[PDB]
Symmetry: C3
Subunit: 166 residues, 3 copies
């Protein structure tokens, strides 16, 4: 069947692992996954196509990795994640994007901008701020909560839908 | 007379000590109180009741304490302080609240959200952002300046008024 | 001819050196100038006056300097620079201003507030936030991009125009 290789990136603590686990295992982890990389697989039907999603969950740049860029090199599409209550994580997105563009040696890589932790009220990144950033990249902006599940499927499926346009 | 045990918490440098000293001693300290805990008492009439306010001034989580949580355990109400020119301090509030909820073993603790340094123009937390957070907690939001005294009495007296509802 | 002594200050990474090089050498440096101080000169006609601009490019407070304040002491006007995608750099402005006021031993020093990196879409300091800060200081706010050249001449020439009022 059709395999889609997705990679999740973004600043430490934004909820990359929580999002991925919510998608795959349908529960919210309130704890912090100490791993720097992990891999997941989900067989799912997306718009009438039976798909195998291979998802590489990476750690934030704050942590040293084994083979980060080599692992990332294999990705077909990227979720670029920040948290809506963490302004620095939003500001950091541009460096994550630059890293992707370098590692894929292309300025035209399928991507979705994801504002996570939408269940929290201490919001410091307003939706319209994130919409501007996504517009500058020519990509969609989607908000998620790994806690409540809001947007989680939207985010990953939207990324499959971006890959299918490229 | 009636004693109210108040605790001031929040990120380093937000003005917890300055606020407390303004309330008690009616002056503004432009310097940084190096202490990690200190205690104050003020006999005051609040809405026609003669009250003794006992106020524990704590340091931000960035500094190690002796008995922080044990000391905090004794509090009847908490001022959760951030500074309007310090977005991270606002983002940190939720962890302070979580610490309180743990230490009091309750999700229903009297609290007031306080945005300090309202005399400064480098504002990065807008009033309506802080109002949202306070609304999510079911508590009032009040802005203060330890420098000009704006709001300082409002903040502490409002907290006494919250304790009286619980 | 008339010499104007300008000093560029602000947080690390905001683009102080990039701005100065764009003005003097008409190109954008995508790399990071490792120096902690450097000096530039440009002979230019500003509003019909032949001027020599002497510009001291300083490093952010995060880096230790030789003679920072002594060097700064010699300045007639200051560009106080933050980046529009770096909320902390904006919050830091007030300390830069305080340092200037100390070193010049005056509360009436010619200054311009500069929001750099206006070519970037990950904006977290809105124009109206920066306009408030500049208004509190009684100084102009100008946005720049060292990359595209937008505003760069405006910023420096505006500062010459402030010095001429003092
Ligand atoms: N309230 C709330 N908390 C979340 C959400 N997503 C993640 N978190 C929390 O934020 C913390 C960090 O989440 P985690 O998924 O480990 O983040 P990470 O981005 O993978 N970190 P690393 O870069 O170190 O791998 C966890 O405590 C987790 O429960 C969310 O949508 N809502
Ligand atoms: N302009 C202004 N400055 C304030 C205000 N409140 C506190 N400050 C200043 O901010 C600095 C830190 O204040 P302080 O009260 O020591 O903060 P703190 O929260 O107690 N820090 P700690 O967590 O280390 O105990 C002091 O220089 C003080 O003068 C305010 O309302 N306005
Ligand atoms: N996109 C964009 N990048 C900029 C702009 N100005 C500076 N930069 C970038 O930001 C990085 C840091 O710039 P630099 O001028 O060295 O900053 P600085 O303020 O002098 N740093 P220091 O305090 O260490 O001297 C450089 O990579 C540079 O290319 C700008 O207007 N737009
Ligand atoms: C996932 C998360 O952010 N938390 C569970 C908050 C607490 N964290 C991160 C944390 C880290 C490390 C240690 N420790 O080494 O002892 C902690 N002890 O309590 N919380 C800890
Ligand atoms: C209260 C406050 O934030 N200040 C007075 C600003 C200066 N601070 C914090 C500060 C700290 C430590 C030292 N020092 O150890 O030498 C300082 N020297 O000048 N300002 C200092
Ligand atoms: C100017 C700038 O911010 N950059 C070029 C981004 C990369 N930076 C800052 C950077 C710093 C130091 C080192 N290093 O010591 O090896 C780097 N190696 O790649 N980028 C580096
Ligand atoms: Mg993780
Ligand atoms: Mg980690
Ligand atoms: Mg915008
Ligand atoms: Mg599109
Ligand atoms: Mg204190
Ligand atoms: Mg302290
Ligand atoms: Mg809101
Ligand atoms: Mg109420
Ligand atoms: Mg520089
Ligand atoms: Mg430097
Ligand atoms: Mg904002
Ligand atoms: Mg305003
Ligand atoms: Mg003027």
């Amino acid at each position: 069947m059709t395999e889609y290789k997705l990679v999740v990136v973004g600043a430490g603590g934004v909820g990359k692992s929580a999002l991925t686990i919510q998608l795959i295992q349908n529960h919210f982890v309130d704890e912090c996954d100490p791993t720097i990389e992990d891999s997941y697989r989900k067989q799912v039907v997306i718009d009438g196509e039976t798909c195998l999603l291979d998802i590489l969950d990476t750690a934030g740049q704050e942590e040293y990795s084994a083979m980060r860029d080599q692992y990332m090199r294999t990705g077909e599409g990227f979720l670029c994640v920040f948290a809506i209550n963490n302004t620095k994580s939003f500001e950091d997105i541009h460096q994550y994007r630059e890293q992707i563009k370098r590692v894929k040696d292309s300025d035209d890589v399928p991507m979705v901008l994801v504002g996570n932790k939408s269940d929290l009220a201490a919001r410091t990144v307003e939706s319209r701020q994130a919409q501007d950033l996504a517009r500058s990249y020519g990509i969609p902006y989607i908000e998620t909560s790994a806690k409540t599940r809001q947007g989680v499927e939207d985010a990953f499926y939207t990324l499959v839908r971006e890959i299918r346009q490229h």
